[PDB]
Amino acid sequence: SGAIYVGNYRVVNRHLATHNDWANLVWEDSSRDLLVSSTTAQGCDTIARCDCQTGVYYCSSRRKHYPVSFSKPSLIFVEASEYYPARYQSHLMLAVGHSEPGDCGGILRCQHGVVGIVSTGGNGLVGFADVRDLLWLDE
């Protein structure tokens, strides 16, 4: 679990969105595994606006933050899970690291701010849904 809190927005994995998220919906995209809902209180996270390929992510199944090198956002084939069939997920970045079911939502960040959140795992790989192109999160 986990979210990004920027401005009056909450960014979560679409597959983990709650009823309150759907009832206060701003934007959602199944192909990216992202959903954004509106919040009453202002958040403290800032979004990175950069081309970094190195950063640090939070892994809840280890209680640890790990430094990683990650690929540029791309269209990647992801295996069937309880939440989606096997399909192509867009705007996804991969790295080598631990990610098991429950780690979705952990933040990946670089020197400029939040880059994205954990969205996929297994086999010693972790995938992150990028948010750096969503410029509207800053206004």
**Of the residues 21, 33, 103, 130, which is catalytic?**
33
Q: Is 33 a catalytic residue?
A: yes
Sign of CA dihedral 35, 67, 54, 98: negative
Answer yes or no whether residue 104 interacts with ligand A1B1E by CB under 6 A.
yes
* 53 contacts Zn ion (rule: CB under 5 A): no
Give the full edge-to-edge strand order of the sheet including 25-29. 4-13, 34-44, 25-29
Which residue in 25, 50, 75, 96 binds Zn ion (CB under 5 A)? 50
Query: Using alpha carbons only, what angle is made at residue 107 by residues 71 and 3, rounded to the nearest 5 degrees?
Result: 130
Tell me, yes or no, if 104 is annotated catalytic: yes
130 is a contact residue toward ligand A1B1E (CB under 6 A): no
- Pick 50 or 75: Cβ nearer Zn ion: 50
47-86: which residues touch ligand A1B1E (CB under 6 A)? 78, 81, 83-84
The SS3 call for residue 119 is strand
Is there binding between residue 112 and Zn ion (CB under 5 A)? yes
**25 sits near Zn ion (criterion: CB under 5 A):** no
| C-alpha span between 12 and 87 (Å, rounded) | 20
Q: How many CB atoms lie within 10 A of CB 125?
A: 14
> What count of other Cβ atoms lies within 10 Å of the Cβ of residue 30?
14
In this structure, the number of other CB atoms found within 10 A of the CB of residue 12 comes to 23
Nearer to Zn ion, 92 or 108 (CB): 108
Is 59 assigned to a binding site? no
Q: Is residue 52 a contact residue for Zn ion (CB under 5 A)?
A: yes
Q: Catalog residues that contact ligand A1B1E under the rule CB under 6 A.
A: 15, 33, 78, 81, 83-84, 89, 99-101, 103-104, 119-122
